[PDB]
Amino acid sequence: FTAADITAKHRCLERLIVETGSAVSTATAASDVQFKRPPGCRELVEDPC
Amino acid sequence: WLVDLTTATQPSVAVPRLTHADTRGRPVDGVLVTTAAIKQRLLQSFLKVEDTEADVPVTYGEMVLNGANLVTALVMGKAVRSLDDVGRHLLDMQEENRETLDELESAPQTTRVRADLVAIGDRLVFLEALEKRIYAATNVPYP
Amino acid sequence: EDTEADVPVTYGEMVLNGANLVTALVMGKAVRSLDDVGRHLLDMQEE
Amino acid sequence: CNTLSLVRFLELGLSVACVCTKFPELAYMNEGRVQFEVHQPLIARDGPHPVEQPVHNYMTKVIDRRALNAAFSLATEAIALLISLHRQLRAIQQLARNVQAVLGAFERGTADQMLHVLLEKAPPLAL
Amino acid sequence: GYRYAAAMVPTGSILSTIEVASHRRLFDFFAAVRSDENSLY
């Protein structure tokens, strides 16, 4: 549910699949719950969803 | 499936410098870095061995900003990789692209290392797993 | 009057010959009288 | 009151193979350009079809930098003194091997720099 | 490739021969050219 962010993406397929190899999630593997990603850290997720 | 990890990818360009060849023969065109666990159960019961090949120990060549570069370096701010030949050749074709002197000069000295090659169908593919090698015992994660 | 007699000279020139070509069609900067500078840039660092 | 306070280590050989090219000596530099020239050939198609021109392709690429980092290792009075040189400089010889240890910090993180960007240029296989 | 007189020596293997630029278009500069173009000269 974000009107901007899906609309913010491009659609040239060459850059689409390679972002799936290294995307940044909104989750954090350094917290007890899914704390929404702290603005200083990287995650390097795969994320096909 | 394991042939399709290979052979769905296009090669890029060759160089006669990078001599990764098997002991007495065939060259190498693959890498396949995995973890030690996946390396274990794969070569145990899926693949074959032709090991201990010959590659270069000498780290790959040298670019120095010598008098060809160095003059162009500070005086104009221009820099050309190997201005020697491409200055020479383009001076001679001036008196009468196809520049096939990209890198083929000497084929420097090779030695023999513990290397694990596999035969994925056609290709001679290298394969090494490296945690205990260089990722061991630090606080850096494995990729 | 000193005289009415003069001794001038003839032209000078510089043409892109030695490495000035390579510095123009591969690099951008083309140094006037490059090779006398380019040697001496390899000469000063050993003094 | 015992020895065996010693371990040894080095890492080369494969440390050049996966690297799969090298330019050494980057000077004070600002921009690195490599341009590509490829020529898609054509096929003479017959009949009432559009005429395929001999096509041309010219593009350029730029470098990145992504510099690496190195450790700090120096206490006090090893640089000074108070002559016990076979012990006082053997502290420094062990300190030189600590520099040799962070020389290993270039050969080891070398492949790490690759496997960062090697996963960067990779789609998933089922894609 | 950008400096065309540099590519007069290729000094390396044009080796893959796969459909360029239908891939990821990850190149900082690339030009899909037909038989000729005036900027080559």
Short mmCIF file of C-alpha atoms in Angstrom, two decimals:
data_model
loop_
_atom_site.label_atom_id
_atom_site.label_comp_id
_atom_site.label_asym_id
_atom_site.label_seq_id
_atom_site.Cartn_x
_atom_site.Cartn_y
_atom_site.Cartn_z
CA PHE A 1 0.00 0.00 0.00
CA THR A 2 2.05 2.85 -1.36
CA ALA A 3 0.80 4.94 -4.24
CA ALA A 4 4.18 6.50 -4.93
CA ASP A 5 6.67 3.68 -4.56
CA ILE A 6 5.33 1.11 -7.03
CA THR A 7 4.68 4.04 -9.36
CA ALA A 8 8.21 5.27 -8.59
CA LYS A 9 9.77 2.19 -10.15
CA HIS A 10 10.96 1.96 -13.75
CA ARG A 11 10.08 -0.87 -16.08
CA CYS A 12 13.15 -1.56 -18.22
CA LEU A 13 13.68 -5.26 -17.50
CA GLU A 14 17.49 -5.16 -17.50
CA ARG A 15 17.57 -3.22 -14.26
CA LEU A 16 14.58 -5.02 -12.73
CA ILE A 17 16.07 -8.47 -12.21
CA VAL A 18 19.44 -7.29 -10.92
CA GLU A 19 17.82 -5.28 -8.17
CA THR A 20 16.24 -8.52 -7.01
CA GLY A 21 19.71 -9.96 -6.51
CA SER A 22 20.52 -7.15 -4.07
CA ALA A 23 17.57 -5.13 -2.80
CA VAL A 24 17.29 -3.36 0.54
CA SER A 25 14.47 -4.65 2.70
CA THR A 26 12.41 -2.70 5.14
CA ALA A 27 13.13 -5.31 7.84
CA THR A 28 15.99 -5.72 10.28
CA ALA A 29 17.77 -8.89 11.36
CA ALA A 30 19.19 -7.06 14.38
CA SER A 31 16.08 -6.49 16.51
CA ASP A 32 13.61 -8.54 18.51
CA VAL A 33 10.56 -7.64 16.39
CA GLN A 34 10.44 -6.48 12.80
CA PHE A 35 11.61 -3.03 13.68
CA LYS A 36 11.29 -0.92 10.53
CA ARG A 37 14.74 -0.41 9.02
CA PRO A 38 16.96 2.09 10.83
CA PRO A 39 18.05 4.84 8.45
CA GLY A 40 21.73 4.12 9.04
CA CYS A 41 22.24 0.43 8.16
CA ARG A 42 22.18 -1.86 5.10
CA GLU A 43 20.49 -5.23 4.74
CA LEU A 44 21.05 -6.56 1.15
CA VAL A 45 17.93 -8.70 0.94
CA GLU A 46 16.64 -10.71 -2.05
CA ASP A 47 12.84 -10.04 -1.75
CA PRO A 48 10.79 -11.23 -4.76
CA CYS A 49 7.56 -9.90 -3.22
CA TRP B 1 20.15 -28.18 -13.39
CA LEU B 2 23.86 -27.87 -12.69
CA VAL B 3 24.71 -27.48 -16.34
CA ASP B 4 22.27 -24.58 -16.40
CA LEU B 5 24.21 -22.69 -13.76
CA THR B 6 26.70 -22.56 -16.59
CA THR B 7 25.94 -21.99 -20.28
CA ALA B 8 23.15 -19.47 -19.80
CA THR B 9 25.77 -16.72 -19.55
CA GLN B 10 27.64 -15.06 -22.38
CA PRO B 11 31.42 -14.71 -22.30
CA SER B 12 32.82 -11.20 -22.45
CA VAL B 13 36.28 -10.96 -23.99
CA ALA B 14 39.43 -13.06 -23.99
CA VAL B 15 42.97 -12.19 -23.03
CA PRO B 16 46.04 -14.32 -23.83
CA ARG B 17 47.54 -13.16 -20.54
CA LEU B 18 45.11 -14.93 -18.22
CA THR B 19 46.42 -18.47 -18.54
CA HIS B 20 44.15 -20.58 -16.39
CA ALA B 21 44.69 -24.01 -17.88
CA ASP B 22 44.53 -27.57 -16.64
CA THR B 23 47.73 -29.51 -16.10
CA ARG B 24 48.93 -30.28 -19.64
CA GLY B 25 46.03 -28.98 -21.66
CA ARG B 26 42.51 -27.50 -21.48
CA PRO B 27 41.77 -23.92 -20.33
CA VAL B 28 39.33 -22.88 -17.60
CA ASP B 29 36.27 -20.65 -18.06
CA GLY B 30 34.28 -20.96 -14.80
CA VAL B 31 34.60 -20.05 -11.13
CA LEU B 32 31.68 -21.29 -8.93
CA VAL B 33 32.41 -20.12 -5.37
CA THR B 34 30.11 -21.88 -2.92
CA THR B 35 30.18 -22.74 0.76
CA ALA B 36 32.04 -25.75 2.15
CA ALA B 37 28.86 -27.69 2.90
CA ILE B 38 27.47 -27.30 -0.61
CA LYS B 39 30.92 -28.06 -2.02
CA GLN B 40 30.93 -31.25 0.03
CA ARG B 41 27.74 -33.01 -1.00
CA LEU B 42 28.03 -31.88 -4.59
CA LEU B 43 31.43 -33.27 -5.63
CA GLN B 44 30.86 -36.33 -3.43
CA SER B 45 28.03 -37.72 -5.51
CA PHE B 46 27.41 -35.60 -8.57
CA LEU B 47 30.56 -34.51 -10.33
CA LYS B 48 34.08 -35.45 -11.36
CA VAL B 49 37.64 -34.37 -10.61
CA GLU B 50 40.61 -33.24 -12.67
CA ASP B 51 42.62 -31.29 -10.13
CA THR B 52 45.86 -29.37 -9.40
CA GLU B 53 46.08 -27.09 -12.40
CA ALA B 54 48.55 -24.42 -13.49
CA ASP B 55 47.85 -20.70 -13.20
CA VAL B 56 49.89 -17.51 -12.85
CA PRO B 57 51.26 -16.70 -9.38
CA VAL B 58 52.51 -13.34 -10.59
CA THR B 59 49.92 -10.69 -9.93
CA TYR B 60 48.56 -9.43 -13.16
CA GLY B 61 51.01 -7.11 -14.85
CA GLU B 62 51.62 -3.39 -14.36
CA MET B 63 50.31 -0.01 -15.43
CA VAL B 64 52.71 2.79 -14.57
CA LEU B 65 52.36 6.43 -15.51
CA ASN B 66 55.68 6.59 -17.32
CA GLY B 67 56.84 9.27 -19.80
CA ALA B 68 54.09 8.50 -22.29
CA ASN B 69 51.41 9.00 -19.64
CA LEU B 70 53.25 11.36 -17.26
CA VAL B 71 53.76 14.07 -19.87
CA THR B 72 50.09 13.94 -20.85
CA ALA B 73 49.14 13.49 -17.20
CA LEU B 74 49.98 16.85 -15.67
CA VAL B 75 50.34 19.05 -18.75
CA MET B 76 46.93 18.46 -20.29
CA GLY B 77 45.19 16.25 -17.79
CA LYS B 78 44.88 13.49 -20.38
CA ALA B 79 45.48 9.83 -19.67
CA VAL B 80 45.60 6.90 -22.07
CA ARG B 81 46.16 3.30 -21.07
CA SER B 82 49.31 2.21 -22.94
CA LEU B 83 49.88 5.39 -24.96
CA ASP B 84 53.10 3.80 -26.32
CA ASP B 85 51.68 1.49 -28.98
CA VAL B 86 48.45 3.38 -29.60
CA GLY B 87 50.54 6.46 -30.13
CA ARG B 88 52.99 4.51 -32.30
CA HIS B 89 50.38 2.58 -34.31
CA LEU B 90 48.25 5.65 -34.86
CA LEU B 91 51.35 7.50 -36.01
CA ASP B 92 52.10 4.74 -38.50
CA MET B 93 48.57 4.36 -39.84
CA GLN B 94 48.84 8.11 -40.32
CA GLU B 95 51.50 7.19 -42.83
CA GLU B 96 49.35 4.08 -43.68
CA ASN B 97 38.83 -0.46 -33.79
CA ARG B 98 41.19 -3.20 -35.02
CA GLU B 99 43.71 -2.67 -32.20
CA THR B 100 44.53 -6.33 -31.53
CA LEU B 101 47.44 -5.42 -29.25
CA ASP B 102 45.07 -5.11 -26.24
CA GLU B 103 47.06 -7.56 -24.07
CA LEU B 104 49.22 -10.25 -25.65
CA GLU B 105 52.89 -9.71 -24.88
CA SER B 106 54.81 -12.29 -22.89
CA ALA B 107 52.51 -14.89 -21.22
CA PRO B 108 54.28 -14.63 -17.83
CA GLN B 109 55.40 -17.40 -15.52
CA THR B 110 52.87 -19.91 -14.20
CA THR B 111 53.15 -22.29 -11.27
CA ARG B 112 51.07 -25.12 -9.87
CA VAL B 113 48.40 -24.70 -7.20
CA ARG B 114 45.84 -26.92 -5.49
CA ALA B 115 42.86 -26.22 -7.75
CA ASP B 116 39.66 -28.20 -8.16
CA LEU B 117 38.30 -28.39 -11.69
CA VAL B 118 35.05 -30.08 -12.67
CA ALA B 119 33.63 -31.15 -16.00
CA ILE B 120 30.18 -29.59 -16.20
CA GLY B 121 29.21 -31.15 -19.50
CA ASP B 122 31.26 -29.20 -21.98
CA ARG B 123 33.02 -26.59 -19.90
CA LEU B 124 36.06 -26.95 -17.69
CA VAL B 125 34.81 -25.12 -14.65
CA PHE B 126 36.88 -24.19 -11.60
CA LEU B 127 35.27 -24.70 -8.18
CA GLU B 128 36.48 -23.67 -4.74
CA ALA B 129 34.72 -23.08 -1.43
CA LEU B 130 36.34 -20.56 0.87
CA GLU B 131 35.44 -20.09 4.50
CA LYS B 132 38.41 -21.77 6.15
CA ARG B 133 40.69 -20.20 3.53
CA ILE B 134 40.21 -16.44 3.99
CA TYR B 135 36.88 -15.87 5.73
CA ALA B 136 37.94 -17.89 8.76
CA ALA B 137 37.80 -16.64 12.35
CA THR B 138 37.08 -12.93 11.83
CA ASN B 139 34.06 -10.77 12.50
CA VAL B 140 33.37 -10.38 8.78
CA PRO B 141 30.34 -12.35 7.53
CA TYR B 142 30.57 -14.72 4.58
CA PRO B 143 28.91 -13.35 1.41
CA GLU C 1 70.28 56.84 -38.04
CA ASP C 2 72.02 53.61 -37.20
CA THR C 3 71.68 52.30 -40.77
CA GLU C 4 69.02 51.42 -43.21
CA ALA C 5 69.68 47.67 -43.08
CA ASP C 6 67.92 44.88 -41.27
CA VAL C 7 68.53 41.18 -40.59
CA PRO C 8 65.19 39.46 -39.85
CA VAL C 9 64.55 35.75 -39.57
CA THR C 10 62.25 33.21 -41.25
CA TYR C 11 59.24 31.39 -39.72
CA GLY C 12 58.97 28.97 -36.86
CA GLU C 13 56.56 26.09 -36.55
CA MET C 14 55.28 23.09 -34.62
CA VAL C 15 53.46 20.14 -36.21
CA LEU C 16 51.81 17.26 -34.32
CA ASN C 17 54.38 14.56 -34.97
CA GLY C 18 55.89 12.51 -32.18
CA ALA C 19 53.45 11.90 -29.35
CA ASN C 20 51.32 15.05 -29.73
CA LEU C 21 49.12 12.97 -32.05
CA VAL C 22 48.53 10.29 -29.41
CA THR C 23 47.84 12.95 -26.78
CA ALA C 24 45.22 14.54 -29.04
CA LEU C 25 43.32 11.62 -30.52
CA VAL C 26 43.38 9.49 -27.36
CA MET C 27 43.99 12.07 -24.68
CA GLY C 28 42.65 15.59 -24.87
CA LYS C 29 45.60 17.68 -23.72
CA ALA C 30 48.25 18.31 -26.35
CA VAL C 31 51.41 19.88 -24.90
CA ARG C 32 53.36 22.24 -27.13
CA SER C 33 56.96 20.94 -27.22
CA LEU C 34 55.90 17.81 -25.33
CA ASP C 35 58.93 15.59 -25.78
CA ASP C 36 61.43 18.07 -24.39
CA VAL C 37 59.13 18.40 -21.39
CA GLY C 38 58.24 14.72 -21.32
CA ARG C 39 61.85 13.61 -21.07
CA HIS C 40 62.60 16.19 -18.41
CA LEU C 41 59.58 15.00 -16.45
CA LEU C 42 61.42 11.69 -16.43
CA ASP C 43 64.66 13.49 -15.55
CA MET C 44 63.83 15.65 -12.53
CA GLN C 45 62.85 12.82 -10.17
CA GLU C 46 66.42 11.50 -10.19
CA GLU C 47 67.88 15.06 -10.34
CA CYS D 1 55.81 -20.32 32.00
CA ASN D 2 55.57 -21.89 28.56
CA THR D 3 55.93 -21.27 24.81
CA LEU D 4 53.71 -22.24 21.81
CA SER D 5 52.47 -18.69 21.61
CA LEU D 6 52.81 -18.82 17.83
CA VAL D 7 50.52 -19.27 14.81
CA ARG D 8 51.32 -18.62 11.16
CA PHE D 9 49.31 -17.61 8.13
CA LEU D 10 49.34 -16.33 4.52
CA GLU D 11 46.93 -16.29 1.59
CA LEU D 12 47.89 -16.04 -2.08
CA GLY D 13 47.68 -18.12 -5.27
CA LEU D 14 43.92 -18.25 -5.67
CA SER D 15 44.13 -14.60 -4.54
CA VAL D 16 44.97 -13.69 -8.15
CA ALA D 17 42.88 -16.27 -10.05
CA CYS D 18 39.32 -15.22 -9.25
CA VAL D 19 40.44 -11.57 -9.49
CA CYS D 20 40.76 -12.18 -13.22
CA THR D 21 42.50 -8.90 -14.03
CA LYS D 22 44.52 -6.15 -12.36
CA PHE D 23 45.77 -2.67 -13.01
CA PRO D 24 48.11 -1.61 -10.21
CA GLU D 25 49.19 1.98 -9.43
CA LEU D 26 46.15 4.20 -9.46
CA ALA D 27 47.51 7.72 -9.14
CA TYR D 28 45.65 10.90 -8.25
CA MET D 29 42.74 10.19 -10.54
CA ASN D 30 39.32 11.69 -11.23
CA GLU D 31 37.58 9.75 -14.02
CA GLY D 32 38.15 6.37 -15.65
CA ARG D 33 36.54 5.77 -19.02
CA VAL D 34 36.36 2.56 -21.01
CA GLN D 35 34.29 2.65 -24.20
CA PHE D 36 32.88 -0.33 -26.07
CA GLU D 37 32.56 -0.73 -29.84
CA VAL D 38 30.48 -3.67 -31.08
CA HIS D 39 28.91 -4.29 -34.47
CA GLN D 40 25.77 -6.28 -34.78
CA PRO D 41 25.96 -7.90 -38.21
CA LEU D 42 22.86 -8.06 -40.39
CA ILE D 43 21.17 -10.73 -42.50
CA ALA D 44 20.01 -10.01 -46.02
CA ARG D 45 16.28 -10.66 -45.67
CA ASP D 46 14.49 -11.34 -48.93
CA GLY D 47 11.31 -9.88 -50.34
CA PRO D 48 8.93 -7.09 -49.25
CA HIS D 49 10.76 -6.36 -45.99
CA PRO D 50 12.48 -3.24 -44.60
CA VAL D 51 16.13 -2.93 -45.53
CA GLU D 52 18.39 -3.75 -42.61
CA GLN D 53 21.11 -1.11 -42.37
CA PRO D 54 24.63 -1.97 -41.18
CA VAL D 55 24.19 -0.96 -37.58
CA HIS D 56 26.70 0.35 -35.07
CA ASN D 57 26.97 0.39 -31.29
CA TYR D 58 29.17 2.73 -29.25
CA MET D 59 28.82 3.08 -25.50
CA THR D 60 30.98 4.12 -22.58
CA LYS D 61 31.38 3.01 -19.01
CA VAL D 62 32.74 4.73 -15.93
CA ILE D 63 34.64 3.36 -12.96
CA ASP D 64 33.58 3.35 -9.31
CA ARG D 65 35.99 3.76 -6.41
CA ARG D 66 34.88 2.03 -3.18
CA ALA D 67 38.15 2.40 -1.26
CA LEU D 68 39.22 -0.08 1.42
CA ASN D 69 40.32 0.65 5.02
CA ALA D 70 43.21 -0.40 7.24
CA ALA D 71 43.84 -0.98 10.94
CA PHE D 72 45.73 1.12 13.48
CA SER D 73 48.34 -0.67 15.55
CA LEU D 74 50.94 1.21 17.67
CA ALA D 75 51.43 1.66 21.43
CA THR D 76 53.86 3.95 23.26
CA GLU D 77 57.65 3.69 23.97
CA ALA D 78 58.35 1.07 21.31
CA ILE D 79 59.05 4.16 19.21
CA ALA D 80 61.27 5.48 22.03
CA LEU D 81 63.53 3.61 24.54
CA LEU D 82 64.30 4.10 28.28
CA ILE D 83 70.40 -2.02 25.06
CA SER D 84 68.17 -5.14 25.13
CA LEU D 85 67.86 -4.90 21.35
CA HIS D 86 67.31 -8.62 20.72
CA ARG D 87 64.21 -8.26 22.93
CA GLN D 88 63.31 -4.60 22.32
CA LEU D 89 63.42 -4.99 18.54
CA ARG D 90 61.81 -8.44 18.76
CA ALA D 91 58.76 -6.58 20.04
CA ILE D 92 59.05 -4.49 16.88
CA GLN D 93 59.66 -7.55 14.70
CA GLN D 94 56.44 -8.98 16.09
CA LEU D 95 54.96 -5.53 15.47
CA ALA D 96 56.22 -5.78 11.88
CA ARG D 97 54.38 -9.08 11.55
CA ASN D 98 51.29 -7.26 12.79
CA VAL D 99 51.83 -5.06 9.75
CA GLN D 100 52.26 -8.29 7.82
CA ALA D 101 48.95 -9.37 9.36
CA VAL D 102 47.22 -6.25 8.00
CA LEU D 103 48.97 -6.88 4.72
CA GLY D 104 46.80 -9.99 4.76
CA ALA D 105 43.93 -7.54 5.17
CA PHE D 106 44.37 -6.64 1.51
CA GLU D 107 44.62 -10.11 0.02
CA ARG D 108 41.65 -11.42 1.99
CA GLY D 109 39.24 -8.51 1.49
CA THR D 110 40.17 -8.59 -2.20
CA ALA D 111 37.77 -11.46 -2.84
CA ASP D 112 35.31 -9.76 -0.53
CA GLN D 113 35.31 -6.75 -2.85
CA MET D 114 34.52 -9.09 -5.72
CA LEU D 115 31.77 -11.04 -4.00
CA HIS D 116 30.13 -7.78 -3.08
CA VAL D 117 29.91 -6.74 -6.71
CA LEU D 118 29.60 -10.31 -7.97
CA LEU D 119 26.25 -10.59 -6.24
CA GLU D 120 25.46 -7.11 -7.51
CA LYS D 121 25.53 -8.11 -11.18
CA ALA D 122 23.47 -11.22 -10.62
CA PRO D 123 19.77 -11.87 -11.11
CA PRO D 124 18.27 -14.96 -9.48
CA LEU D 125 18.61 -18.12 -11.52
CA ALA D 126 14.89 -18.83 -11.77
CA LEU D 127 14.50 -15.37 -13.20
CA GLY E 1 34.75 2.32 -26.43
CA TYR E 2 33.88 5.94 -25.70
CA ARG E 3 37.23 7.09 -27.09
CA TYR E 4 37.00 5.31 -30.43
CA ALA E 5 40.67 5.63 -31.39
CA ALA E 6 41.47 3.71 -28.21
CA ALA E 7 39.34 0.80 -29.45
CA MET E 8 41.37 0.60 -32.67
CA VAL E 9 43.46 -1.69 -30.52
CA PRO E 10 40.87 -4.00 -28.89
CA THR E 11 43.57 -5.59 -26.60
CA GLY E 12 41.24 -8.31 -25.35
CA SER E 13 38.68 -10.96 -26.26
CA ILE E 14 35.33 -9.88 -27.58
CA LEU E 15 34.15 -13.29 -26.52
CA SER E 16 30.58 -13.73 -25.22
CA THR E 17 28.57 -12.82 -28.39
CA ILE E 18 25.21 -12.47 -26.65
CA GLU E 19 22.46 -9.90 -27.34
CA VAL E 20 23.93 -6.71 -25.87
CA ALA E 21 21.65 -4.08 -24.24
CA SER E 22 18.73 -6.46 -24.12
CA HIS E 23 20.55 -7.35 -20.93
CA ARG E 24 20.57 -5.15 -17.83
CA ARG E 25 21.68 -1.90 -19.60
CA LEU E 26 24.10 -1.51 -16.69
CA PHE E 27 26.57 0.34 -18.87
CA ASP E 28 27.45 3.92 -18.05
CA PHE E 29 27.72 4.57 -21.78
CA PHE E 30 26.76 2.43 -24.75
CA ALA E 31 25.66 3.24 -28.28
CA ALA E 32 23.56 0.87 -30.38
CA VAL E 33 24.82 1.88 -33.79
CA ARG E 34 23.95 0.77 -37.32
CA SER E 35 26.55 0.63 -40.12
CA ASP E 36 27.72 4.22 -39.65
CA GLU E 37 27.22 7.44 -37.68
CA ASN E 38 28.91 10.82 -38.11
CA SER E 39 30.11 11.03 -34.51
CA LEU E 40 32.52 8.15 -35.21
CA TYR E 41 34.80 10.46 -37.17
#
